[PDB]
Amino acid sequence: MEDPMYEQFLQRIQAVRTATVAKDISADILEARHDYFGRELCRALDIEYRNNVLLDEIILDVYPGVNLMEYNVPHVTPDNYIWTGDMLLILDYKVSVGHDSTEVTYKAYTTLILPVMQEIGINTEICIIRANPVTNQISIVGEQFKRLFPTIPVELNFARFFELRKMLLDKFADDEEFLMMIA
Ligand SMILES: [Mn+2]
Ligand SMILES: [Mn+2]
């Protein structure tokens, strides 16, 4: 495994003995899987890769002569964004076999981001790009995003994230407190 990320996770899983440390390994693996999808997606779309940009930072980058202090800016941190010149695409990457996390984030970003951006006068769209880690299929929320990128030519393989997390869960298959933490 010429993969230091995998080796690092494997060493943590070899060593872990308690449920609270195992829960942090689990959450880290899920985040590493999300970050892997983000890197592959941005490279495939030839857009600059970022991971968590404070909304205040996004506004400052798009509208440099803004007085943030005039507006009520929620301090959310979407994964990335595209500024087209006329429109701001707020980008969030998901890796999930389900829709639930997309709905939670769509509702949050729609109700929190869109009002202040209409105040400032920046045309904004909420974009969520989801990879199914089992099937590799990509789902997109975002009309303008879909028009810009009618296909997403990524080659994904999530198997190693599945392998690591399955080891952790097998190691703690009889630990009720761990199972409740990841439930
Ligand atoms: Mn994020
Ligand atoms: Mn995300």
Say which ligand is closest to the CA of 108: 2
- Asked if 80 contacts 47 with a C-beta cutoff of 8 angstroms, the reply is yes
């769509």: which residue's tokens? 106
- Residue 17 backbone dihedrals phi, psi, to 5 degrees: -125, -10
């999808």: which residue's tokens? 37
CB neighbours (10 Å) of residue 16? Answer: 19
Q: Which residues are paired to 126 by β-bridges?
A: 90
- Secondary structure letter of residue 2 according to DSSP: -
Number of domains in the chain: 1
Name the binding residues: 34, 52, 79, 92-93
Domain with 73, as residue range(s), is 1-183
Residue 122: C-alpha distances to residues 42, 51, 149, 150, 171 (Å): 23, 22, 21, 24, 50
Q: Which of 116, 118, 114 is nearest to 127 (CA)?
A: 114
> For residues 35 and 18, what is the distance between their CA atoms, to the nearest angstrom?
26
Give 109: exposed, middle or buried? Use CB within 10 Å, 0-12, 13-18, 19+: buried
């909304």: which residue's tokens? 55
Say which ligand is closest to the CA of 91: 2
> For residues 9 and 29, what is the distance between their CA atoms, to the nearest angstrom?
8
Distance, CA 95 to ligand 2 centroid (Å)?
8
Residue 159 tokens, joined: 């198997």
- Residue 82 backbone dihedrals phi, psi, to 5 degrees: -120, 125
Name the binding residues for Mn(2+): 34, 52, 79, 92-93
Distance, CA 78 to ligand 2 centroid (Å)?
7
- Residue 129 backbone dihedrals phi, psi, to 5 degrees: -115, 120
- Asked how this structure was determined, the answer is X-ray
Residues lying with their CB under 5 A of ligand 1, a single-atom ion:
52, 79
> For residues 23 and 84, what is the distance between their CA atoms, to the nearest angstrom?
40
Say which ligand is closest to the CA of 109: 2
Distance, CA 40 to ligand 1 centroid (Å)?
15
> For residues 65 and 79, what is the distance between their CA atoms, to the nearest angstrom?
23
